[PDB]
RNA sequence: GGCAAACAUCAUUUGGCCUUAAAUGGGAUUCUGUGAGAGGGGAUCCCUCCAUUGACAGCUGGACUGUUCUUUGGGGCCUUAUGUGGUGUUUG
RNA sequence: GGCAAACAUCAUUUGGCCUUAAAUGGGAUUCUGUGAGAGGGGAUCCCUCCAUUGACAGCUGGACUGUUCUUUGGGGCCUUAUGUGGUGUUUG
């Protein structure tokens, strides 16, 4: 019945910057607060226990302090691999309860994406569907816009995209937009293009192909 | 030395059962308390159950009380989670954790080691293996630039899929995107690698797709038209 | 955890045999080389024999070659020293020592842990246990001084002898002297304790003498007339 | 085979003094030299290996250096518990061979002896022998002279003495002189005394008794 | 005189197998308190060795060799001891 | 008013058994790079608790006591969890 209200939900900071995540407990927990780091696809690793003690093998740029019933985690010199979601937990009373989490992006310089476009394989069209893929490789920030134009007519409602997690080394994103059509509809048009707009692009970029070439 | 290996996950119908197990190494179970913590995809962390194999004492979250049964075999040095009467809202990754025992203490401390977890998806859909298609270059840039090629893994269920390139020998420059759920209620993802435009006509680039749910594996070399 | 326990020493007539053993804990013999090194009374240190139980390879000092045989049974995790055809000039303390194995090496390094050792005396005399007498205060000094009491251990053979006080409960201020060889070819030593002049009339102090060769054990109270 | 000539055989120095023991090798040994400390009656503990590396649990006031085929051990600030004998060893070739050793006495200030005299027990007189014990406790230096007087006539050659090893904490010695007689001879005299002369004694001291009481 | 060898002397010094296209060694910055032999491990960067992709040279292919350039890579299991270099002497 | 109990709140926090005369806790300086549970260890000094040998005191002996002096000593086997105090509210 103890609640760990953790804030902020998200933050981003440049490599080298100090960062503080905070967790306030509904009632007295006293030191029985731990802090965890969870990297995408990985299991949480324990960083801080007893509110201020580092678990063995945790870089010393991590630390924690207690102030009454407020607890803060501090990454004193943020590093590219520190992109993760961070969690507080109390173990003063049971049941144990966790904070809602805090996602930490790394802020790096603007990098425009390099763009690629992939026509559907002859191997797929024989199944009745055409998937057209547009690839936005290694950019920052995460905000990018992908429009699909089939014979220069803007498309609506037939694309879906997914974005990688921030690279633990260069702190960039990669985005994948797929344009799904029926073979029949696909064979009705010639020019397929994705047009990308992003912060480090002066003018929009379009990568295209003609169907049978 | 210290490791925990969950197994027993997978796809299961709603109303059905599943028995996860966590096999521990490098420490005695009897000198720890073991815990299951689940993570609904996207949401945070929910403690599920705990057990002190030294005493056999167990405790459960009120949201699994009476459907789940944590337990431990101290000789096998593994721990278990019986899951009965599952619902869709039980789909999550299920981690087990260790809390090291210490004689000086007066209650249990943090969770100091977590298994990588196993994926439990509760659905009415069935296992469908993926299809694999090439994503091949257009040949726009000459020897000055690098090219991108890839594999598209479409129409499969359930998660996950794993992609490697040239059998894991090519890793630099590779992005496997998160799968997206299709209008057809199926998953689809892409994996891409960038390579020098000059190496296409000689080098072989093959993608290794594995969908362990369906026991499916595909190797598809990717070259242009 | 890491310790070595010599046993098997004692008195032997010239021409006889003896089988010392060293029982190891806290490390595997197969990952070390074991060594016997003796110390002639007064002399320094003389390496005697070595063995690498991983290979079974042995080496001997030219001073024992063909009279001694080192060995090890890796199941007991102990090592042995057979001593045949013994001579007087073999009388010494015999330590066993360990050199930790290391894969990066190209020959063995220094001896990094030594057992406490055992005494092997090769003579024609026979063991007879000692006599023990109280050495009690004289009650000469007034409030300026503290008083001294003790035990005298006379007419014994062979070395060694061990003395304790209150079964080891009293140590501060205690000196056990080296035995000196008497005109009879027998040893004799004393052990004393310093105590406050005031504590005699109440406290009881007992001395524990042990001459393990003859299976001799004595406890003697030391108080005044 | 390889000879380890160690020097000096013995030395004495005050606490805090720097101390260098030297070991010269008959031929090339290269770094394969160890240094051992043997405290009296105890098993030797290893201090230095590879001519300069400290073994785990060795105080930093120890050090070793190599100069060609000469090797030195150094105590930069000598401490009382450092009273021991020190041994070099080569492990360059086999057989391994040791130095002759170096005993290290500690030189401290003068400390006067406390003196005691103990008549023989009635339990020993009933065995047929008389042992009279004179005790010199906790003095420095080791050089002390104990005389025996049986009714004020000096004794020679019917006594024997043994001395403790230097105490590893207060760096003092203790001495035991026993005057061994036949029972019958003991019943011939009345006054038994030991007379002690030592550096920290301005006048020489005698502790005596009358036979029995 | 070129050699071998034995010995002396000083100096330096982990050594293999299997699979592989290949299965080096060193330097720097930094993290890690023993979390498996801390004589460790991780990350990032530079050089070096091996292999490898382009390009270029060798008439042109296949090779193969090379390079002040370029691409991508360098696995697994072992080791329980006296090798190697210089100098000298002596022998064949 | 007083005492309980439950709850709220903040703070703090290992708990037993056996043997025993007794079976605390902390501080400073310094050595120890995990030697097997470092949340360690040792040394030196200090404070503190329990016991203890002497001194002074309670008429003297049991006994027993002390804001003072003094001697010496403080063992073993366990532990797998929600104790304790302050405050507030409610109830008896």
Numbering used by the authors:
A (entry chain L), D (entry chain D): 2 to 214
B (entry chain H), C (entry chain C): 4 to 228
Paper's wording?
We obtained an antibody fragment (Fab) that binds to the RNA with low nanomolar affinity, crystallized the RNA in complex with the Fab and solved its structure at 2.84-Å resolution using the Fab as a molecular replacement model for the initial phasing. The HAVx–dV complex crystallized in the P21221 space group lattice and contained two Fab–RNA complexes per asymmetric unit. Overall, dV RNA from HAV IRES folds into a Y-shaped structure that consists of two helical stems, P2 and P3 closed by loops L2 and L3, respectively, bifurcated from a base helical stem, P1, formed by base pairing between the 5′- and 3′-ends. These three helical stems, P1, P2, and P3, form a three-way junction where the P2 and P3 helices stack coaxially. An unpaired region within the P1 helix, L1, forms an asymmetric bulge between the P1a and P1b helical stems. The L1 motif constitutes the binding site for Fab HAVx. Nucleotides U611–A615 form a small stem-loop motif (AL) between the P1 and P2 helices, adopting a lone-pair trinucleotide loop (LPTL) structure. Overall, three base triples, A613•A643-U664, A614•G665-C642, and A615•G666-C641, involving the LPTL stabilize the three-way junction.
Here, we report the structure of a key RNA domain from an IRES that likely interacts with initiation factors, domain V of the IRES of hepatitis A virus (HAV), which is a member of hepatovirus genus from picornaviridae family. Based on its location within the IRES and the role of biochemically well-studied, analogously positioned domains from type I and type II picornaviral IRESs, domain V likely contributes to recognition of initiation factors for recruitment of the ribosome during translation initiation. Moreover, the dV structure, which represents the first high-resolution crystal structure of an RNA domain from any picornaviral IRES, will facilitate efforts to understand the structural organization and functional roles of essential RNA domains within the picornaviral IRESs.
